[PDB]
Design a protein around this ligand. Structure first.
Ligand SMILES: CC(=O)N[C@H]1[C@@H](OP(=O)(O)OP(=O)(O)OC[C@H]2O[C@@H](n3ccc(=O)[nH]c3=O)[C@H](O)[C@@H]2O)O[C@H](CO)[C@H](O)[C@@H]1O
Ligand SMILES: O=c1ccn([C@@H]2O[C@H](COP(=O)(O)OP(=O)(O)O)[C@@H](O)[C@H]2O)c(=O)[nH]1
Ligand SMILES: *[C@@H]1O[C@H](CO)[C@H](O)[C@H](O)[C@H]1NC(C)=O
Ligand SMILES: [Mn+2]
Ligand SMILES: [Mn+2]
Lengths: 7, 495, 487
């Protein structure tokens, strides 16, 4: 499931 | 071979452009029309701290081989990653750029870029995934130091020297830049916060933590010093090549995408190295919400398989907290892990307990005999101390996932506790407010039990359930067990 | 002289009882009917950590004089404080209990208790307040060590030995028990948390801080070890008597109800001593919401006077942060502080900057140039990051006063910031969402200004104001001047 999240 | 400024960007990108009227997000899950407008070497703001903009490093730094893997990347974004490397890095520190084409539909995406100075392209003849692709890149690398980047990044001013400086001084450091944000809709480059460290909850999904007030205060004398991090994001890092080999590269049986970052972060820390984030090094990345490519069969399952391979090798008994957060993962087959286990023995790695105590102490860990742990959720609200202390009432606020006043456990002694305070039934009369009091293992007024498929909390020996109907006008109460929504409560981890 | 168990509690308490139908909170601001039901030596739960209950306590320790001041205390509560001392303490460690009657309406409240073993009573012939009353007690004390308790406390098992152990080893330590809660409505005794330290915000009102996760983790190997504290609550502590004298007792010109906890905490730390909380020592206290007695000056005004006298002597330039939080205090006369200043010189005390760096580093100090600080309120909602980071939207949730994602500042550079992130006008078109981005003084997209009597936020150089109408369906937006915001 979901991608690497944003800093 | 062509020097990058002589490369014909319009010829390369043009031909794959978004056709008239078509959806500009479909191919890449970011706005290709906006990406294609940009010059290959477009100017971006300098997001580095003031002190970086004059500071330094040594004068003989080892050169690096830059490895970039891609599968059906947008031409404009790939070209721009490559030229940001060539333009922003001192030439003598770039040995080569190795492009690993991981079975893209069109082999020309990669091959056309082989004309550019220092670019070598390697095409996988079938789909291999980012882990096996990165390793193919690393195996072909000629330089002493490896650099990995995703295929939609943009390097900023003097991004490289601060990274190399660290590994040149100590080859057991694995180091990353602060990762700036390239917006997936408009492609604006946005400076990220420098006060973050990498981390994760017990579901083993990567997340960003703010540093503690204590950590920030200890850095006031040098605010651009390296930041030790429990975990790297995973796509952008620099590592001594031989150290990468000795430590076991990556686990070759992980597929497609996810959580090789987890695996390598545990392995480095447990086996004697360190992980750092380097504030003076800035690189932008196109963060997106969805994967644009296929997973044989299904991203959910592949991510869980990969994650299991990491947990079963590195986490010892603490893997059971992962399975408490993601119980469906127990049914996912993960294959043979023997050579990874033999690798751990051969390297003399410390146990995961050591990692938690010394590397990630701020990850909150359940007591071995806890029945449940985490937040206590009702809809989008969470059980909250309201900052109260003993003899105070308790309430709800919107769940914030920051822990603190929304952190609780259900203990072996059947108490619902925060710190050394426990939910206490001070009065059994329906409608009575409950209070926080010091936990007393004998005190029967503090005993609670889950019921109805772990969906509610009943006071042991009674027909009273925890109830939020009074929350905003006094606090949580005890009420006769019944079908109301205000009596629904779930812990985030269930043992 | 009578042994405490032989004392006739019903005779002592039973005239002064709440008459039929009358308000049981009026006299004391706690429930007197519920207090009067209790036996003078009623059983209370042992709230100590497991490890405390196994320790065998030294008893080869210096004895103490216990000083208890009171003004119109409920007979049942005062008796109970005295007997909890006599019952729970080894007899040889109690030299005496000195009751300082601070001009109670009825002198018999105190005098009838003088029959009890070890009890001495001192009556002030006019109202003096707790600071001068405590000093009168201390001056009369015969023992080497002083113990102070409020007149509505209940000592628990082996409360005293762990306190005396500390000051016997090092006389510059001033030590307190963990203070359990005696509920002001039902009088149940409730175990307090052991994970607290004392502290204060810039308004100089005492408050309890949780220890940090880091502090708690360091203590895992000895969870009942002394806790160093920046400040004591003030009413329950043990101190070497000669040390109390040498350090300047209390400021004799403070009145009624102080301030004095603040003053003595600063003085001890700055002048070479320490403050501790001792987990194995447990004593209950009737916490109340209002004072039941009169204040000639204040209470608002007397509290500010006393607090002034502390700030002006001990805080150096940092007093200006107190006045920034409580500007009305600048108009409150506070009298002569000369002998307190001469005391500070004479003792060679460190500056307040030292105290902040070394004793209370976690107290956040607005070394400026901030225009505003805190939560940004709209009705019952607060500006909230939603846990988002750079390039994320921003929103509202209900105000929780816990800080964290609802903490913001308006800087000298005119930016609205959380950590190193700033509210950024990414697009000037009305209805555009704003985003969080790394702060740059430059970025004119990050500049904001208060308007209309600090009731709204306008984007500098535009006719755009911060607007919540989009909050639950995208995030906060910029809109032509839901636009009400207050720090
Ligand atoms: C549990 C605790 O730490 N309580 C402290 C809290 O006050 P409290 O909020 O506990 O106020 P309180 O009225 O209980 O404290 C006063 C104590 O001194 C007595 N008294 C009071 C007024 C007076 O004019 N004469 C007199 O003798 C009173 O009867 C009681 O024994 O903070 C104060 C700061 O000033 C004191 O340090 C208290 O001990
Ligand atoms: O099967 C794959 C999946 C991903 N990638 C590459 O691995 C990098 C990381 O993937 P992505 O950017 O999809 O992950 P995110 O950064 O969003 O977590 C990108 O260069 C991808 O093109 C690849 O080469 N093969
Ligand atoms: C996010 O983690 C994944 C895990 O497969 C990849 O390492 C990807 O490259 C990461 N993205 C960033 C920006 O590091
Ligand atoms: Mn990526
Ligand atoms: Mn009191």
């Amino acid at each position: 499931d979901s991608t690497t999240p944003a800093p | 071979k062509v020097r990058w400024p002589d490369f014909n960007q319009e010829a390369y990108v043009g031909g794959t452009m978004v056709r008239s009227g078509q959806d500009p997000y479909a191919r890449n899950k970011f706005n290709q029309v906006e990406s294609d407008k940009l010059r290959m070497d477009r100017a971006i703001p300098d997001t580095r701290h003031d002190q970086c903009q004059r500071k330094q490093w040594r004068v003989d730094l080892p050169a690096t081989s830059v490895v970039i893997t891609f599968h059906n990347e947008a031409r404009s974004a790939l070209l721009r990653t490559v030229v940001s490397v060539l333009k922003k890095s001192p030439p003598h520190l770039i040995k080569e750029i190795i492009l690993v084409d991981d079975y893209s539909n069109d082999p020309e995406d990669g091959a056309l870029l082989g004309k550019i100075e220092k670019v070598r392209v390697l095409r996988n003849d079938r789909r291999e995934g980012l882990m096996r692709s990165r390793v193919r890149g690393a195996d072909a690398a000629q330089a002493k130091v490896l650099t990995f980047l995703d295929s939609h990044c943009e390097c900023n001013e003097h991004w490289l020297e601060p990274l190399l400086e660290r590994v040149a001084e100590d080859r057991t450091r694995v180091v990353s830049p602060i990762i700036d944000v390239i917006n997936m809709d408009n492609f604006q480059y946005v400076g990220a916060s420098a006060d973050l460290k990498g981390g994760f909850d017990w579901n083993l999904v990567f997340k960003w933590d703010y540093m503690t007030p204590e950590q920030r205060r200890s850095r006031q004398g040098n605010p651009v010093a390296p930041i030790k991090t429990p975990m790297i994001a995973g796509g952008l890092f620099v590592m001594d090549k031989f150290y990468f080999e000795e430590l076991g590269k990556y686990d070759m049986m992980m597929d497609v995408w996810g959580g090789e970052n987890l695996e390598i972060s545990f392995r480095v820390w447990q086996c004697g190295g360190s992980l750092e984030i380097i504030p003076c090094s800035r690189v932008g990345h196109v963060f997106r919400k969805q994967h644009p490519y296929t997973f044989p069969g299904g991203s959910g399952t592949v991510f869980a398989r990969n994650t299991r391979r990491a947990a079963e090798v590195w986490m010892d008994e603490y893997k059971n907290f992962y399975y408490a957060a993601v119980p469906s993962a127990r049914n996912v087959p993960y294959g043979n892990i023997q050579s990874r286990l033999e690798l751990r023995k051969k390297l003399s790695c410390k146990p995961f307990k050591w990692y938690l105590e010394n590397v990630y102490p701020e990850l909150r860990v359940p007591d071995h005999q806890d029945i449940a742990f985490g937040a206590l959720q009702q809809g989008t609200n969470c059980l909250d101390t309201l900052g109260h202390f003993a003899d105070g009432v308790v309430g709800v606020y919107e769940c914030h996932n920051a822990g603190g006043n929304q952190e609780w456990a259900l203990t072996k002694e059947k108490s619902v506790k925060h710190m050394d305070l426990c939910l206490t039934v001070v009065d059994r009369a329906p409608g009575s407010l409950i209070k926080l009091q010091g936990c007393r293992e004998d005190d029967s007024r503090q005993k609670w039990e889950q019921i109805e498929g772990n969906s509610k909390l009943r006071h042991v020996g009674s027909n009273l359930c925890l109830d939020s109907r009074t929350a905003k006008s006094g606090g949580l109460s005890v009420e006769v067990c019944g079908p109301a929504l205000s009596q629904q409560w779930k812990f985030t981890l269930n043992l």
